[PDB]
Structure formats: structure tokens, C-alpha cells
From a paper:
PIEZO channels transmit mechanical force signals to cells, allowing them to make critical decisions during development and in pathophysiological conditions. Here, we report several near-atomic resolution cryo-EM structures of fast-inactivating wild-type human [name] (hPIEZO1) and its slow-inactivating channelopathy mutants with or without its auxiliary subunit MDFIC. Each hPIEZO1 subunit has a curved blade structure, and the three subunits form the trimeric PIEZO channel, exhibiting a bowl-like shape. MDFIC, a MyoD family inhibitor protein, has recently been identified as an auxiliary subunit of piezo channels capable of decelerating channel inactivation and attenuating channel mechanosensitivity.
We selected the mild GOF mutants hPIEZO1-[name] and hPIEZO1-E756del, familiar in African populations with a slightly longer inactivation time, and the more severe R2456H mutant with a much longer inactivation time. The E756del mutation is located at the THU4 and THU5 linker, the [name] mutation is located at the THU9 linker, and the R2456H mutation is located at the IH of the pore module. At the same time, the channelopathy mutants [name], E756del, and R2456H present a slow inactivation rate with half inactivation time of 13.4±3.8 ms, 18.5±4.1 ms, and 23.2±2.9 ms, respectively. We then tried and obtained almost twice as many hPIEZO1-[name] images as the wild type but only achieved a 3.7 Å resolution cryo-EM density map. Yet, the resulting overall structure is similar to the wild type. Based on these results, these three hPIEZO1 channelopathy GOF mutants may be structurally less stable than wild type. However, in the mild GOF hPIEZO1-[name], which has a slower inactivation rate compared to wild-type hPIEZO1, the acyl chains of the pore lipid are retracted from the central hydrophobic pore to the side of the IH, although the hydrophilic phosphate group heads still interact with R2456. Consistently, the slower inactivating hPIEZO1-[name] mutant has the same hydrophobic acyl chain tails retracted from the hydrophobic pore region, implying that the pore lipids are involved in the fast inactivation of hPIEZO1.
Numbering used by the authors:
A (entry chain B): 2132 to 2277
B (entry chain A): 1693 to 1747, 1779 to 1803, 1940 to 1980, 2001 to 2050, 2060 to 2180
C (entry chain B): 2425 to 2521
D (entry chain C): 2425 to 2473
E (entry chain A): 2474 to 2521
F (entry chain A): 1408 to 1423
Amino acid sequence: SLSSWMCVEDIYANIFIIKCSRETEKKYPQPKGQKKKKIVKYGMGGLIILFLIAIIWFPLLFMSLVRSVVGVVNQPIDVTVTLKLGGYEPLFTMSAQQPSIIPFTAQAYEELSRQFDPQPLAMQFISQYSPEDIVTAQIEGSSGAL
Amino acid sequence: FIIILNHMVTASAGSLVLPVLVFLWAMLSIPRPSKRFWMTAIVFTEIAVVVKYLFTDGYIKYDLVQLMALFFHRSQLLCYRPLRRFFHDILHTKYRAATDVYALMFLADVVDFIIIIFGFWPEAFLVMLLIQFSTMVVDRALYLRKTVLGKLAFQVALVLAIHLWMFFILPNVVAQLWYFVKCIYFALSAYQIRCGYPTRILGNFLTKKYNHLNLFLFQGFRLVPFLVELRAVMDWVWTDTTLSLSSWMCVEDIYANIFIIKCSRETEKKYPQPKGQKKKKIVKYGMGGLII
Amino acid sequence: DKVSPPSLGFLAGYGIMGLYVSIVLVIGKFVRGFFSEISHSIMFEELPCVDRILKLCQDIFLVRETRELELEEELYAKLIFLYRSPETMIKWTREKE
Amino acid sequence: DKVSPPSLGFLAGYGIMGLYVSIVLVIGKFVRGFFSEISHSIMFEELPC
Amino acid sequence: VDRILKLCQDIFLVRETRELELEEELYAKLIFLYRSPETMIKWTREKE
Amino acid sequence: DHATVIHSGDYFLFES
Ligand SMILES: CCCCCCCC/C=C\CCCCCCCC(=O)O[C@@H](COC(=O)CCCCCCCCCCCCCCCCC)COP(=O)(O)OCCN
Ligand SMILES: CCCCCCCC/C=C\CCCCCCCC(=O)O[C@@H](COC(=O)CCCCCCCCCCCCCCCCC)COP(=O)(O)OCCN
């Protein structure tokens, strides 16, 4: 049948592998009572040990490597400001666009640091941002609309 | 204890000298730490007091305890080229009652491993984990090959390295512990370099008594993923054998299973059960219940 | 505030931490396979001289070629009764020196 | 440019290619189970009466 | 399982004192107990 | 030879 066919084929595969090994040990005999050479041991064993470390630590390492990335400075393109009295049409509307939007120079950042040096909570906040993350929108004081 | 506790609190670079010297001059001296160790410690602690005085609020409180503890010792110890020579003694002495403290040197290393992992709060953690693992492997090698000179060198290296890396490069309750537990490792290691390895070092540790605790610890150690396998290969590489790896690992399996049967045969001789007695309902409902 | 666009952000979350642990467990049991019950197959893998069995296995094949299928059945019976009696394999597989 | 909204886009990426390979390997070892050591249980499965 | 525990512990003693010729001869006994199901029913019987 | 010592056990060793 098939069960029996496959049991004859398994016996043959394993009897072959034993036969091959019996031959090699007749062509290259080893003396009685001779320690296995250190090189063989350190080679085979070494690889196995390494594989185990690389199945535990390495996965974690690679995931943590992925986590070493950056963030992007998304400065505003437009800073739209409106002053509205109650229900009525806005009194003032201005759109500070690219030129009016000026990123902080290192000097403007040092000036901010100086101005807020007396407030430790303000310095703790300022120190979270780069000079590129802080922008001055120079909003023109005349309404850009009638 | 106090010299090491000072370095955990102050964490400077002045309070690093004495902990290094404890682990590499005091604990590795065969007869007893000499006068010169104790006098060095007294003089150094006095200096640091003066120096810090001549320069915050907290500065000289722990150093007062230190100095007074070192002068207490002196009172008890009074009521009752050189480098080569020092090393020679350690390597070849005659006052070496031999002991085996590998079991425990290892438990300290396990506990550390756990601290690093559990309290991971990252490249730092990653590198440190590998370091701890690699020290454990080297330790096994020097145990199985029985080298005291190798253990001396490993101690010297590790003491200096950890005391520098963790106190300059790397910089915290987690790291404060890691340090205490690694200090216990350096102490136990020094006992072994001073006492010497025994004659019969091979064997297991939990397979000496055939009780019930032993069975449950053996079986538990087998469950940790990878431990059983790494032990086997490591012991093969370093012990001198005529067998291969296939055959080494077949002798180690026969032994594990013959142990487990032996433990169970013992329990059933100490606590016999009558012929023809039904298994009690509680046992059944407990085991079965959980499975369901 | 700085915005953040990752490329390999599929490996994120505590579900990914749990996944890792589970992988280790599975691989662990696979490795145990090679180191656990290797004493149960010593009877069928430590045979001293495997030559007389190689002749039976190669004679089943010759018979299949020349289509004399009655002898395929009788030679299958010998192979199955060697592997069903552990002590007749220690007679057939001994080093005849 | 044309925009693109897939519905079954969970099967995308080279991670999905690697996943496929791994599945094959696992199933492969499972099938081997049936064809490998079937000679070790002949004593307990070929009983005449 | 007591007589097998003695063979397994004697392989270990020989490895300690480095008399590696007897490690080979004692491995041969352990391998021929596990290769003959009926010599294990003689070695592992309760000697009462 | 090593492999003729490993593979040479008989039923006489497991005797008395
Ligand atoms: C014209 C009719 C002539 C005779 C027809 C019936 C004779 C052959 C009967 C089997 C063929 C028809 C059934 C098809 C299903 C095949 C499996 C089966 O036999 O059906 C049964 C197996 O039980 C039997 O063996 C009863 C005999 C029926 C099949 C006999 C074929 C050879 C008999 C010895 C081998 C045992 C089964 C091996 C077959 C598959 C091996 C991978 C289902 O276990 P399974 O494998 O699913 O478990 C795998 C679960 N993971
Ligand atoms: C200076 C030269 C001195 C002699 C060199 C050759 C003697 C040793 C030969 C093996 C070492 C060199 C080959 C490295 C590959 C190691 C595996 C191997 O032997 O290569 C073969 C195994 O076949 C052989 O055993 C042929 C003998 C070569 C190795 C002999 C070592 C001991 C022999 C008895 C054990 C059998 C294999 C055990 C080795 C690994 C056990 C986990 C590959 O099956 P594997 O395991 O990959 O299947 C796992 C698949 N999942």
C-alpha cells in the first residue's frame, strides 16, 4: 500500500546513512582512548552557542535599531490671525506667510533664554525646542482685508 | 560594606579608588589584609575629607562613618619586585583549604541578568545584556578547566572595567542594585582565587539529594528556554572526553531521566499508598479541574 | 512640535513585545526536540554492521524491477519482523569478524 | 497623478515575502513528521492478532 | 533505577581523573543496555 | 581503535 511503501523507503534512508558513517570510520580510524581534538569541539560547540544568543538578543537589537530615527521640523506655511468682535465681521484678518514667518536665529534663541532665565519652568520649556522649531510670525498690524 | 556603600551614594571618582583596592589587594591577600591596607584606607579617607572641605550641604557624613569604622577595626586588630611576590603567594601558597563556590557565583550573575532585563528603563541595555551573558560563559570555562591564574586575570580585568564603565561612560535604583549584586560576585570570586579549586568539580548541583524540592527545581531549570542545551555543549568543549557530541548528549539524557525516576521512586517509599485504595477526590478534582 | 514618519513602524507596540516572547518559546521547544528523547531511538540508530539489512532492502528493489511480485511480499515480511523484534536485530546486525 | 486605495493591502511588503517563506518551512517539518521516523513504531503498530 | 545510576556516575568519575580509556568501555555498557530491551528488564528489577 | 571499543558490548558484561 502506501503506508507500507513508505516504511520500506524510510528503513532504506536510515540504513544508508549509518552505512556511510561506518565507512568513514574505517578509512580514518581513531585510536583507543584519544580525546576529541579541541578544534573540533570549539568549532561545533561554538556555532551552537552563538546561534542561541542570536535567537534571543539579536531580534531585540534589530527592533531597537529601527527605533533610532528622527523627527521633521514642520514649520507653519501660513499663520492666519483674526480679531473678531462678537457675531460681527472680523475687525482684523492677517495671513503671515513664508517670509513673515522667520525661524529663530541662535541669537534670538539666546535672547529668549536670557529673558526667561529667572523662570526655571520657562527654561525647562524653551530647552525642549530647537531654534528651527521656534518661529516668529511677524503678523502685519494693518488688516490685510478691508 | 561601608567602603562600597560610600561609592553608591557619592558616586564620584575619588570614592572609586578604595572599592577597587578592596577587591584587588585586600580580598586577594592570603593571610590577612596587612597593616598597609588599613593604613592606606585611613589616610585616603582623611585626605578626601580635607579636600572636599577646602572646596553643597551634604559632603562629609558618610566619610565620618567610614573613618570611624576603620579605626574600630584597628582597635580589635590590636587587642588580639613586591608586586611579583604578592602574586606569587596567591598563585602558589600552602594555606589553601579548597572550596567550590561556583553554584553561588552563578546565582549572583542570574540575579543581575534579571535586574538588567526587568528594569530596562535602548543600546545601553542591549550592550549590557550581552556583556553579562559573555562573562557567564567565560566563568564556566575557567571552572571546568580549573585555572586559578585565569580567574585572577578575569577578576582584575572585570573589576577595573565595571568600575570605569558604570562610573564614567554610562552616566537610579536599578543601577545601584546591579552594582551591589556585582559586588557580591567579586567577593565570592576572590574567595575562590584564595582558596583554590577542589578535586571533584564535575557533576550537577540539584542532583545530589533525591527529595521533592530537588525534583521541582530540576524540572524547572529544564523549562527555561536554552539553558539545558547550552550547558551541555559548553561542558563538552571544555571537559576532556573521547566521545563526540552526539554521544555526549546521549549520556546526558539518560542521566536526566534516570534521576527523575529515582526521585519518584523515593517519594513512594517514604509515603506509601495501600493496595487497592482509590485516588482521593481532592487530587482528582484539582489536577483535572485545572486542565479542563 | 516635530512630526514623525517611520518606515519600519510595523515593529511597534507591546503586542510586538509579546510576539517576541512567544517566538522564543516555540523555537525553544523545537530545539528541545533534538536534546530530549534521543535515548528512545538507540535501538534503531546504533547498529554495528548495517550490511545484511542493505541486502534485503536492495533485493526488494530488484524484485520490483523484474516484476516477480510474489517475492516482494515475502521479503517485506522479513524486513517487518526484524523491526518488530529488538533481539533479532542484535543478531543480524553484529560485526562478523 | 492617480491615487490608490487598496482593500486587502495587509498582504504587502517584503516582510510578507519573508513570512511566506517561514510558513513553508514550518509546514515542511510537519509533513516530514509523517514520513520520517515511522520505523520506530513498528513494534507497537504492526501487531498480527 | 539504581544500577543504571551507578554506571552514569562512574562515567563521570573517570572523566575527572582523566582515565579516558575507561570512559569508552563504560559507554559501551550504557549503549548496550538501551539497545536490548530485555537486558534492561534484568538490570532494572527490584532486588528483594 | 576507538570505534571498535565503543561498539563492542555484549550480554556478558550485564551478567551477575
Ligand atoms: C474500490 C474500493 C477498494 C478498497 C477501498 C478502501 C481501501 C483503502 C482505504 C483507504 C482509501 C480510501 C480512504 C481515503 C482516505 C485515505 C486515508 C484513510 O485510509 O482513511 C483513514 C485512515 O484509516 C485507515 O487506514 C482505514 C483504511 C482506509 C484506507 C486504507 C489505505 C491503506 C491502509 C493502511 C494505511 C492507513 C491509512 C493510510 C492512508 C493515508 C496515508 C497518508 C483516515 O486517516 P488519515 O490517514 O486521514 O489520518 C490523518 C489525520 N491527520
Ligand atoms: C580535521 C577533520 C577531522 C574530522 C572532520 C569530520 C569529522 C566530524 C564531521 C562533522 C563535523 C564537520 C561538519 C559540520 C556540520 C556538523 C553536522 C554534521 O556532522 O554534518 C551532517 C550530519 O551528518 C554526519 O553526522 C556526518 C559526520 C560529519 C560530522 C560528524 C560529527 C559527529 C558524528 C556523529 C553525529 C552526527 C552529526 C552530529 C553533528 C551535529 C549535531 C547537532 C549534517 O547533519 P546536521 O546535524 O546538520 O542535520 C540537522 C538538520 N536539521
